[PDB]
RNA sequence: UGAAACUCAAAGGAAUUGACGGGGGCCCGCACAAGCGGUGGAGCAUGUGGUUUAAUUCGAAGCAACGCGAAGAACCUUACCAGGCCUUGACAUGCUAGGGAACCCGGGUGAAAGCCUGGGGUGCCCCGCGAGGGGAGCCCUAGCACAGGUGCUGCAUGGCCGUCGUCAGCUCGUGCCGUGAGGUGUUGGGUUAAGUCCCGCAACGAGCGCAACCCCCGCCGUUAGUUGCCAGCGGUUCGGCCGGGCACUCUAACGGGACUGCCCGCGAAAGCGGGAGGAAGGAGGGGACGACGUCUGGUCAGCAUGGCCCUUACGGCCUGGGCGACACACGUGCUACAAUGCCCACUACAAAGCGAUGCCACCCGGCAACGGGGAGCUAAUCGCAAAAAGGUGGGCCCAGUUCGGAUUGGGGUCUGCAACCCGACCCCAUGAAGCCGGAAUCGCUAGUAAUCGCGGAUCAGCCAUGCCGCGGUGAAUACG
RNA sequence: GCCCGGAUAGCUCAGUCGGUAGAGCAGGGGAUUGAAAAUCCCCGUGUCCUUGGUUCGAUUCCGAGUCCGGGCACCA
RNA sequence: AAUUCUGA
């Protein structure tokens, strides 16, 4: 039982936050709770896009909701009906100006949360996990990178003897700070146990 | 201490006598790092010297601390099922440490209720070759020599 | 001693004030 | 269990042993209608749990037997009144003199309701030999009249005692956590709770399954 | 006794003494910093994800 | 010379890779030695076994469980018991019916929960001023599908964390050798904390490891000036208090510098020793980081979730009891046995954090805890706040005492609806055992051990002696 | 039945001129070991068979009885 | 010069 989260370890430098906004010790509670109620509602209606991140800035009485995705589409619809009914559901419980935004992800294979949900689906759709991993990893390194690593917990195939298939490629020094490595973690939900998957995508440096 | 031969920490020269040793002696009288409430007692003893012998507490030191230095003590070893506690020489460095220690302990034994009195007196009897610290010196030297039977065990 | 509730350190170790440790 | 219902305990015997556990435990519990309550719990109780006396902690099974017998007869008295005894006085045999030929020294005490006959010729008198033959007939009786209180009581207990793998009355397993009464078929899920004295119910059922076939 | 418990953690009935803290992510009742309002677990999992403004692993 | 009955699904040879050795060789860690202070003795605080109680919920079990969950159990918490009640239910969705559709306010019986019962009256879609009701928020009674479970299964699981281990290790690709398992690389030689590196070598590279890249502390500077200042002087009632000033102090941001670069000794190099210069050397002192993996370890009771089980109760609510129970037993801690001491009076030096139904300057009452008033503070500008040991001078004079403070009796203050269980403080009177502790046993190699005090977290208050930080004084020993 | 000897901690045995109750083992607590045994510390442990007497008072000295271990029961 | 660990 070792290894610690590679995000909270890079926060300082390397990786940036995901919700920056100063606050006073009398609101922080209520406001921070708001951000959660947002990631909670954005959790459901948005999974079809691949919410690979949700940065939220806030100066005061406003919100800088930015939902980064690799495939927008369903986020808006074809003009402005969905992304409009989302600002609706939003302020339908948030007293502020939900200033929404939407980025794009050019290489969806180089985004951990994506590759995570990806395999997380190949699992629920009964696929050779032994394959799906060596294939999802055989997708990154080719589509440009230097390191790749995926991990799946016990219950592969349903065997009661819970294993844990490793599988990585390239380089992945989780000890080296100057590197920036994308980390992801999705949860397959099948009839038997409740598997877990981790994605490790290596990128830049300096 | 298996790699380096450790290091002989440095003693800051005294701040009255200028002796790198007149401090090593106070340090042993220092309980809880209170060198002020320690050196005080010591200096209050030096006044019991100059107030009970014209001898300046300096030769009462280089003498009482020299008449206590054990030439050889016993350091046990075991060759294999051998309860042989071999006798052997003492490192000039060690000697001092063993001395000063026995001096404080001995001091802390006398029936004098104050303190500096004890240190002063024990220093007098030890310079005058008859203090409880020397009692431990001969006691130690008896064990030694008396076992010269183990002379081929000078590890 | 540090448990004698009727002295100096009695209150020091305790963290209170009383007849045996008035407010300066 | 016998301290919750209100009954009183007497530890007639308890004895340790080598490593850990218990060698023999014999207890006497009183109170009104006590045997009827601990009569169904008479057999071999199986246990299945992770073995603490193993390094790997493997799942292991343990067997132990429980016997139950009430306190009926207690006295010890065999006063053989010379009512059923046929004493004979035959002439002594062996050495002696005129007196061994002419004195009816030898005696034969005959136990008529049994068939056993003891004889004595050790001494030279009849009244000391019929009395010495009763100090012997009483002895050989004190072993063949107690041998029947050991043979009428070795088939009076029952039969369930092999302790083998396959002779269990109830199974206690803390692994998956449940109790299995192999007589009635019930499967209780509180094993750590049954190990405190809550037995009224499986004794309720063992007194229906047992006295339901006769 | 968890859901039906937070449904008593929301109001502030008779007296204030029975007013007690409670995490927001889960029903944690112990180790809850009035400040954030979250237990030490949720708190740690969030401070790790980065969803916490200005929070960062110390070091001295 | 030499069988059978019976019985077993193997007995067996050599050769891998490991593990183990009361085998060997080389080299590490407060592992022992060296050295200091502590436990186990006493009283007490806390956790645990046991025992008992109707219940004393539960888990954790050698190191790696036991001041551990628990960083705040009087009802709350609360999951346990006794008792009173509620069942569409405290909550999420949705359906159906006439009520009813925002809504606020009484009475009665009961300990409370709950059941009963008394009123104002509901904008609104809107044919329509209207009789009416379509009406959306949406509350009430009845019905259905459901909700709920801290009930079980941590060897069904996720995630997270402990330990080996801050150990020097573990692998892959290709080639070669071996029929193969498998080895070689990764051995030997030397060095280092290190599979760090150097040299050879059927190997050549590479990956996960260490390191470095991150922060704190030390030396220096640039920019910055309501903290600091006669460094310069001014007036200065005399407190940087005034104006006035960035040279210091400091505060936070960006950089330099140390790298074995320079000399000399050794070696083929790597590298080691010592010397200087330098504030600082051979990883300068601390963090943070902890590999393939082991322990079917622990955790369904933080959350999630497979599976089993109950659903007018295994759910929900309530007053109250319990988790605090004591003839015993183990662990971690606190205060002590004292003169390098205790008590008494007076006066000084820190750091890190923390304060609006919040920390409280200063007066007045009360010996006091504590209570009135009231100013200042969104805080490098006011307060919490006195740091303590110490420096200092006056009395105890070695007696279980002016040591030590357990226990008990009497009196009060403060939160809190409420201190019998069961709180923290104040005063008086009580002053028990303990005179350094059998066998065994704990930590630490330097600003460390010891000693002394300050802050925070949770929290109304607190059983906090626990935990996480901060600073004052400041050692002995290491041959091996 | 005669003569001789004994019973004392749960077990096996010692012991006093009458006033003192002891040894080894067992058993309990702690300690070591991962845990057992072995080892080490710390303790407790009795109408001295019952029933009478003398004595100031008896586990001991005499009387009776109960049980146990022995030796004796020959000449005809 | 110092014994033992059953059986998924
Ligand atoms: Mg060290
Ligand atoms: Mg054996
Ligand atoms: Zn939580």
Curated annotation (Swiss-Prot), chain A:
GO terms for biological process: translation. GO terms for molecular function: mRNA binding; rRNA binding; structural constituent of ribosome. InterPro entries: KH_dom, KH_dom-like_a/b, KH_dom_type_2, KH_sf_prok-type, Ribosomal_S3_C_sf, Ribosomal_uS3_bac-typ, Ribosomal_uS3_C, Ribosomal_uS3_CS. The keyword Glycosyltransferase does not apply. Residues 39-107 form the KH type-2 domain. Keywords: Ribonucleoprotein, Ribosomal protein, RNA-binding, rRNA-binding. The keyword Cytoplasm does not apply. Part of the 30S ribosomal subunit. Forms a tight complex with proteins S10 and S14. Binds the lower part of the 30S subunit head. Binds mRNA in the 70S ribosome, positioning it for translation. HAMAP family: Ribosomal_uS3_B. Belongs to the universal ribosomal protein uS3 family. This is Small ribosomal subunit protein uS3. The lineage of its organism: Bacteria, Thermotogati, Deinococcota, Deinococci, Thermales. The gene is rpsC.
From Swiss-Prot, chain B:
Keywords: Ribonucleoprotein, Ribosomal protein, RNA-binding, rRNA-binding, tRNA-binding. CDD domains: uS7_Bacteria. Pfam families: Ribosomal_S7 (PF00177). One of its GO terms (molecular function) is tRNA binding. Signal peptide: none annotated. InterPro entries: Ribosomal_uS7, Ribosomal_uS7_bac/org-type, Ribosomal_uS7_CS, Ribosomal_uS7_dom, Ribosomal_uS7_dom_sf. SUPFAM superfamilies: Ribosomal protein S7. One of its GO terms (biological process) is translation. GO terms for cellular component: small ribosomal subunit. It comes from the Bacteria. Part of the 30S ribosomal subunit. Contacts proteins S9 and S11. Belongs to the universal ribosomal protein uS7 family. One of the primary rRNA binding proteins, it binds directly to 16S rRNA where it nucleates assembly of the head domain of the 30S subunit. Is located at the subunit interface close to the decoding center, probably blocks exit of the E-site tRNA. This is Small ribosomal subunit protein uS7. The gene is rpsG.
UniProtKB/Swiss-Prot annotation, chain C:
Residues 1-12 have a biased composition (Basic residues). The keyword Hydrolase does not apply. Transmembrane segments: none annotated. One of its GO terms (cellular component) is ribonucleoprotein complex. InterPro entries: Ribosomal_bTHX, Ribosomal_bTHX/bTHXc/bTHXm. GO terms for molecular function: rRNA binding. Signal peptide: none annotated. Residues 1-24 are annotated as: Disordered. Pfam families: Thx. Keywords: Ribonucleoprotein, Ribosomal protein, RNA-binding, rRNA-binding. Part of the 30S ribosomal subunit. Binds at the top of the head of the 30S subunit. It stabilizes a number of different RNA elements and thus is important for subunit structure. Belongs to the bacterial ribosomal protein bTHX family. This is Small ribosomal subunit protein bTHX. It comes from Thermus thermophilus. The lineage of its organism: Bacteria, Thermotogati, Deinococcota, Deinococci, Thermales.
UniProtKB/Swiss-Prot annotation, chain E:
Pfam families: Ribosomal_S14 (PF00253). SUPFAM superfamilies: Glucocorticoid receptor-like (DNA-binding domain). Zn(2+) binds at residues 23, 26, 39, 42. GO terms for cellular component: cytoplasm; small ribosomal subunit. The keyword rRNA-binding applies. Its cofactor is Zn(2+). InterPro entries: Ribosomal_uS14, Ribosomal_uS14_bact, Ribosomal_uS14_CS, Ribosomal_uS14_sf. Binds 1 zinc ion per subunit. Gene3D superfamilies: 30s Ribosomal Protein S14, Chain N. Keywords: Metal-binding, Ribonucleoprotein, Ribosomal protein, RNA-binding, rRNA-binding, Zinc. One of its GO terms (biological process) is translation. GO terms for molecular function: rRNA binding; structural constituent of ribosome; zinc ion binding. Binds 16S rRNA, required for the assembly of 30S particles and may also be responsible for determining the conformation of the 16S rRNA at the A site. Part of the 30S ribosomal subunit. Contacts proteins S3 and S10. HAMAP family: Ribosomal_uS14_2_B. Belongs to the universal ribosomal protein uS14 family. Zinc-binding uS14 subfamily. This is Small ribosomal subunit protein uS14. The gene is rpsZ.
């Amino acid at each position: 039982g070792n290894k610690i989260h590679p995000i909270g370890f890079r926060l300082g430098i390397t990786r940036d936050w995901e919700s920056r906004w100063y606050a006073g010790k009398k609101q922080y509670r209520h406001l921070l709770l708001e951000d959660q109620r947002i990631r909670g509602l954005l959790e459901k209606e948005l999974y079809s896009a691949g919410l690979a991140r949700v940065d939220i800035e806030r100066a005061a009485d406003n919100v800088a909701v930015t939902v980064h995705v690799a495939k927008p589409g369903v986020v808006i619809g074809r003009g402005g009906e969905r992304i409009r009914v989302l600002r609706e559901e939003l302020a339908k419980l948030t007293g502020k100006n939900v200033a929404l935004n939407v980025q794009e992800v050019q290489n969806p294979n180089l985004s951990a949360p994506l590759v995570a949900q990806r395999v997380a689906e190949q699992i629920e759709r009964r696929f050779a996990v032994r394959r799906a991993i060596k294939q999802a990893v055989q997708r990154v390194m080719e589509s440009g990178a230097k390191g790749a690593k995926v991990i799946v917990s016990g219950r592969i195939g349903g065997a009661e003897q819970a294993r844990t298939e490793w599988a990585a490629q390239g380089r992945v020094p989780l000890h080296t700070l100057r590197a920036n490595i994308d980390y992801g973690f999705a949860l397959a939900r099948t009839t038997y146990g409740v598997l877990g998957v981790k994605a490790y995508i290596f990128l830049g440096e300096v | 201490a298996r790699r380096r031969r450790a290091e002989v920490r440095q003693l800051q020269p005294d701040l009255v006598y200028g002796d790198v040793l007149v401090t090593a002696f106070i340090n042993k009288i220092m309980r809880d790092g209170k060198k002020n409430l320690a050196a005080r007692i010591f200096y209050d003893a030096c006044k019991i010297i100059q107030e009970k012998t014209g001898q300046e507490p300096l030769k009462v030191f280089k003498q009482a601390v020299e008449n206590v230095k054990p030439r050889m003590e016993v350091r046990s070893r075991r060759v294999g099922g051998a309860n042989y506690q071999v006798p052997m020489e003492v490192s000039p460095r060690r000697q001092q440490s063993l001395a000063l220690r026995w001096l404080v302990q001995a001091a802390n034994q006398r029936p004098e209720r104050r303190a500096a009195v004890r240190i002063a007196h024990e220093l007098m009897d030890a310079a005058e070759g008859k203090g409880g610290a020397v009692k431990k010196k001969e006691d130690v030297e008896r064990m030694a020599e008396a076992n010269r039977a183990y002379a081929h065990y000078r590890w | 001693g540090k448990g004698d509730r009727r002295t100096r350190r009695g209150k020091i170790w305790r963290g209170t004030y009383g007849k045996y440790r008035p407010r300066k | 269990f016998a301290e919750r219902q209100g009954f009183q305990v007497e530890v007639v015997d308890l004895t340790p042993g080598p490593e850990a556990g218990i060698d023999y435990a014999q207890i006497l519990v009183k109170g009104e209608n006590a045997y009827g309550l601990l009569s169904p719990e008479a057999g071999v109780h199986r246990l299945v749990r992770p073995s603490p006396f193993d390094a790997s902690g493997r799942r292991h099974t343990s067997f132990a037997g429980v016997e139950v017998i009430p306190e009926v007869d207690e006295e010890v008295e065999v006063v053989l009144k010379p009512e059923e005894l046929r004493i004979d006085v035959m002439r002594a045999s062996g050495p002696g003199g005129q007196g061994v030929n002419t004195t009816d020294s030898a005696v034969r005490v005959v136990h008529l309701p049994t068939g056993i006959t003891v004889t004595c010729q050790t001494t030279r008198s009849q009244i000391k030999n019929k009395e010495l033959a009763l100090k012997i007939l009483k002895a050989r009786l004190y072993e063949l009249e107690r041998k029947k209180r050991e043979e009428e009581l070795k088939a009076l207990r029952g039969e369930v005692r092999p302790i083998e793998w396959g002779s269990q009355i109830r199974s206690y397993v803390l692994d998956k956590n449940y109790v299995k009464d192999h007589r009635t078929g019930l499967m209780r899920h509180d094993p750590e709770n049954v190990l405190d004295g809550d037995l009224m119910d499986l004794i309720w059922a063992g007194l229906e399954w047992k006295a339901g076939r006769r | 006794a968890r859901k039906a418990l937070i449904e008593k953690a929301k109001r502030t009935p008779k007296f204030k003494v029975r007013a007690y803290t409670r995490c927001v992510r889960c029903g944690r009742a112990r180790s809850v910093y009035r400040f954030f309002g979250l237990c030490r677990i949720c708190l740690r999992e969030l401070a790790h994800k980065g969803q916490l403004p200005g929070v960062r692993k110390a070091s001295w």
